[PDB]
Amino acid sequence: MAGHRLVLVLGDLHIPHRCNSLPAKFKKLLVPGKIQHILCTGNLCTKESYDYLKTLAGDVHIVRGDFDENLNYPEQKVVTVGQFKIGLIHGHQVIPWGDMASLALLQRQFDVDILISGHTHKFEAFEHENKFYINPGSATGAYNALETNIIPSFVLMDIQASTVVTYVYQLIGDDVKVERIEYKKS
Template identity: 40%
Template sequence: MASNFGELVLVVGDHFIPTRSHSIPPQFTRMLLPGKMQHVICTGNLGGYYYESEEYQRLKELVGGGSANVHCVAGEYDFLSSFPVASVANASSGTTAAIMSPSFPETKVIQLGQFRVGIIGGHQVVPHGELHALSMTRRKLNVDILVCGWKRQEGVVEFDGGYYIFPGSITGAYSASEPNSRPSFILLAVQNDKIVCYVYKLKENAEVDVSKTEFSKKHYIGI
């Protein structure tokens, strides 16, 4: 699959499991198979404590089980803690092993093909989701593409010489700004200096709608 489409990058965020949603829709889980992605980008708000660790493990499975290509940042409701969040007893040895809550940075920059990609939770940009404010953040990070969570309107926007990717919520979790959001995620096919972006959205009739956008590297971005 990767040889035909380039590097496949899953972009997700705002799971909020179990606080605002029970699970990822089965229509999506049937599509997101283990080991099929080269990278996963997550804008945070996986869940909390044990559930956050559990959802993070699922993301790692999508890239074959490792964490090197799972790029997560902290959402406003993530627990940034290195303390044990649960304990599991080992019956054979009588010892207790701690399950650690993953700790994510506020921002992260990665390289995909010829693109520098910045990742943020979105809550730290005010006004939330406002493109002029996001443009300042993109320039500060010196990136071609800014992936941003918090905003529930999924899709890709070109603005002020850069690209902005909003994955929405993969579970359709509500927010104050968008109480009736629909589940969505984004798949990127990165081909050196070109990206094909597929936006997947679960409609009210339980069918999955897919839209496609293509864009190329702008060599002056970030200067």
């Protein structure tokens, strides 16, 4: 993976109010010395989880969730990694949640190739009208505003040239499912 840039994408942990920690099998995968950047959708919700992210990578980016204690976090962020402009927002601002029309407006407003958002606690990674939309879900399986059957998940973006290969990690039963999703810039 020389020349690849590995970006961990996760959020909605809701530690400690809703969950105590990440699943054991996720923690065995998330080890220091591999990830280059972390893009976090927020709702950590405390400094202890931010410190944990810093153990995984030096470059940690977080946006403000509606339950985060740290009010210094920006509401939204745009970053460039390789050839991709990437937008990041927690997503409680999007009503109804996950609304495709509202996310596409945010894509155009941020002017990004990839838009990352959270809040639904439901993993999604898909291309729509030649732009890419990622929701990493909740890496702890925290309950959301509506329901409790939440699949723990996170995403890893492997960026090279104008291609991103998005690896999705889901805890289904007690086993980790891994799938690979490709998106190419035009």
